[PDB]
């Protein structure tokens, strides 16, 4: 056994950023083709359905919800199919665009740089009060808690973090 | 919403989870279309986890934390509901978060329950039973539940009820997801004598669980047991 | 069901030092130290049993003195060696906690990885003999502005000194 | 010293390595008491590595580099010898380095070769055969040899000859170490749009290998096969 990492495909893709590079192009492509075939099987199941069970919705309604979910194409006869380019865009959105690393950048917070976490420090917090945490700025409110992520610093903004 | 708001059977109600055997109804809040919040410790979705006591054998992780009283009073449940809703609003306030939440809402578990190919039928485990004001109940489809942690209070995760034996989370169908989460705790990490001690913003933690949830709702998740080794450049 | 995490070696963690040395728990650290203290006692005992030497390259007194110096053995008036617990602990600490990669980075004042684990693929051809490239005193960060922000080690800024393989 | 300097049998000589079967003598330089430098690719110290060709099955590491011509000419061997000597001077220029190098010189492999308890005897593999001007040889104890890399040119390591089957590196005795190293290459790493692309200072790499060597010379190394798992805080 060598030294190194033990990592999960699902975690690496969910965190994104730098770690996503540990999944090789081949495996990325194999996964994508696999799920493209799963989506085609959903389109095929929909196309066979001519009636709907239960009274909670009409078939047309339910078919439309799944055309919208999977971004299926529909021809003039009502048959669905999976368009490769629409699939690729959606699959990219769901596995490479929606990532923890991308949200860090949108929130403009300081965070870990990998999903792996060996820290032991855990804190009780209280985010309901706007004096502690806002929708707009999180802990880094606009006192000097908005510079150098001081709102996230557990020493500087110690009142907001009680160690367990 | 506040925890003490009266039930209406529509967005505030006592509910039961299908397959959660003999459970007493728990109060739940539909904070948005297809998404509900249940301010209770999760003693329901894992048949092997029916109580809040530490395990016989200690979990092999860097840190765990037990307190069977956490999330037991109305005041704590109000604060949990308000904290979770505030994190949703924070995610929704970003273009990326609005996109992700829209994808979640559109990600209705596929109706793959028919054994006859000419009929379309729901998979009834992608539902919750919503008790109405008159005492009756209605089976309602949902995509996502945010629920309190189980015994280990700082263990957050996205899971199906029980285990995904039918591979709904990996076959394109998708299934209703439960995120065990608490907005009342957060992990610390070291970064940058001059090593600053920081805390993870819980909106990022929730977003991570929401990402797992969308993979699992679109049926494109990769089995969490699929792990591989990456060797180091030895020296 | 395998978890995510690190697969790490005691020898590497102790050699690199710094933050990674914390992955070895106090118990294991103490168990290794006692084990090597017992090995040192076995060397002292082997020396005390030896009354002659094989070969003609050295005398027995010379060899005993060299190993008394190597292992910092105490020697009584009869010439018997023993291992002193406090001298051992200081020596063992020097060798395993003072001489570390992390402690060298700090002395050289260079920029370096923060863990022994390395998954990089970038490797460069370098030429350190020329003092215009690399000095004994300063490494690549010579006193042009190669001495600020580790610019001497920056492969873009000091690109002439690093040719990617 | 320069590569073309004439032999004297004392600090510049052609040498052979004990147990390195039918090897042709190689030119070696004693840059300091107990420490030699051999500007040759290491086809000697691993019986299973007698040439410079890439392995049949690719090594499972992030990066490897093969070039059977590297370190084959006098020029390259002069530059290698001078590069290593300069890195030793850099380490020695620090208080920590001066201490480390002193500990290495004092760390003579124990004379634990005797099967008779009343007699002290050398372990004859802790030596090299030093060819003299007259063609004779002298078996000389040494502590450390810095030698060029084997087939993979960027693989640096501290090793015994072959494998440590008597456990001399871990039983308090110590044994002669060989550091496979090249001062001609160095790895890059990313740090701090604003990510700096930096290179490891080879003196640090050499220091890391010297730290292995001192553990192994004092017989307090831990087996490199002794690895353990550290689980992550999953979420
Ligand atoms: Zn090492
Ligand atoms: Zn995760």
Curated annotation (Swiss-Prot), chains B, D:
Q: What span is annotated as the signal peptide, if there is one?
A: none
The domain-related comment in the record is: Has protease activity.
Q: Which residues form a coiled coil?
A: none
What is the name of this protein?
Botulinum neurotoxin A2 light chain
Catalytic residues, chain numbering: 209
The residues that hold Zn(2+) are: 208, 212
Q: Where in the cell is it found?
A: Secreted; Host cytoplasm, Host cytosol
> Per its database record, what is this protein's job?
Has proteolytic activity. After translocation into the eukaryotic host cytosol, LC hydrolyzes the 197-Gln-|-Arg-198 bond in SNAP25, blocking neurotransmitter release.
UniProtKB/Swiss-Prot annotation, chain C:
State the compartments where it is located. Secreted; Host cytoplasm, Host cytosol
Site annotated as Transition state stabilizer: where?
A: 116
Residues noted as binding Zn(2+) in the record, renumbered to the chain: 12
Tell me the outcome of changing residue 120 to A: 600-fold decrease in cleavage rate of SNAP25 by light chain
Q: What does UniProt say about this protein's domains? A: Has protease activity.
Function field: Has proteolytic activity. After translocation into the eukaryotic host cytosol, LC hydrolyzes the 197-Gln-|-Arg-198 bond in SNAP25, blocking neurotransmitter release.
The molecule here is called Botulinum neurotoxin A2 light chain
**Species in which this protein is naturally found:** Clostridium botulinum (strain Kyoto / Type A2)
Gene symbol here is botA
- Which stretch of the full-length chain is present here? 251 to 416 of 1296
């Amino acid at each position: 056994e060598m030294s190194g990492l033990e990592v999960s495909f699902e975690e690496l893709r969910t965190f994104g950023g730098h770690d996503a590079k540990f999944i090789d192009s081949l495996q990325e492509n194999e996964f994508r083709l696999y799920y493209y075939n799963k989506f085609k099987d959903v389109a095929s199941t929909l196309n066979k359905a001519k009636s709907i069970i239960g009274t909670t919705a009409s078939l047309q309604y339910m078919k439309n919800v799944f055309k919208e979910k999977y971004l299926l194409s529909e021809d003039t006869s009502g048959k669905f199919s999976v368009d490769k380019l629409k699939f690729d865009k959606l699959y990219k959105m769901l596995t490479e665009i929606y990532t923890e690393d991308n949200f860090v950048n949108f929130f403009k917070v300081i965070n870990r740089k990998t999903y792996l976490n060996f820290d032991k420090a855990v804190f009780r917090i209280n985010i309901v009060p706007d004096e502690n945490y806002t929708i707009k700025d999180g802990f880094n409110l606009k006192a000097n808690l908005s510079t150098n992520f001081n709102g996230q610093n557990t020493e500087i903004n110690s009142r907001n973090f009680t160690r367990l | 919403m506040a925890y003490k708001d009266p039930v209406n059977g529509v967005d505030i109600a006592y509910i039961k989870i299908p397959n959660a055997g003999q459970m007493q109804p728990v109060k739940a809040f539909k904070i948005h279309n297809k998404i509900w919040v249940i301010p209770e410790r999760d003693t329901f979705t894992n048949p092997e986890e029916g109580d809040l006591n530490p395990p016989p054998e200690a979990k092999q992780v860097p840190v765990s934390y037990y307190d069977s009283t956490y999330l037991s009073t109305d005041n704590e449940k109000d604060n949990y509901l308000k904290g979770v809703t505030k994190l949703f609003e924070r995610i929704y306030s970003t273009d990326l978060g609005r996109m992700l939440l829209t994808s979640i809402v559109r990600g209705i578990p596929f109706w793959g329950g028919s054994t006859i190919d000419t009929e379309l039928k729901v998979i009834d485990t992608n539902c919750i039973n919503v008790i109405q004001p008159d005492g009756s109940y209605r089976s309602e489809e949902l995509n996502l539940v945010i629920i309190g942690p189980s015994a280990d209070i700082i263990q957050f995760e996205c899971k199906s009820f029980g285990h995904d034996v039918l591979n709904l989370t990996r076959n394109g169908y998708g299934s209703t997801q439960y995120i065990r989460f608490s907005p009342d705790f957060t992990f610390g990490f070291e970064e940058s004598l001059g090593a600053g001690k920081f805390a993870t913003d819980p909106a990022v933690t929730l977003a991570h669980e929401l990402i797992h949830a969308e993979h699992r709702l679109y049926g494109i998740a990769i089995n969490p047991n699929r792990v591989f080794k990456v060797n180091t450049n030895a020296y």
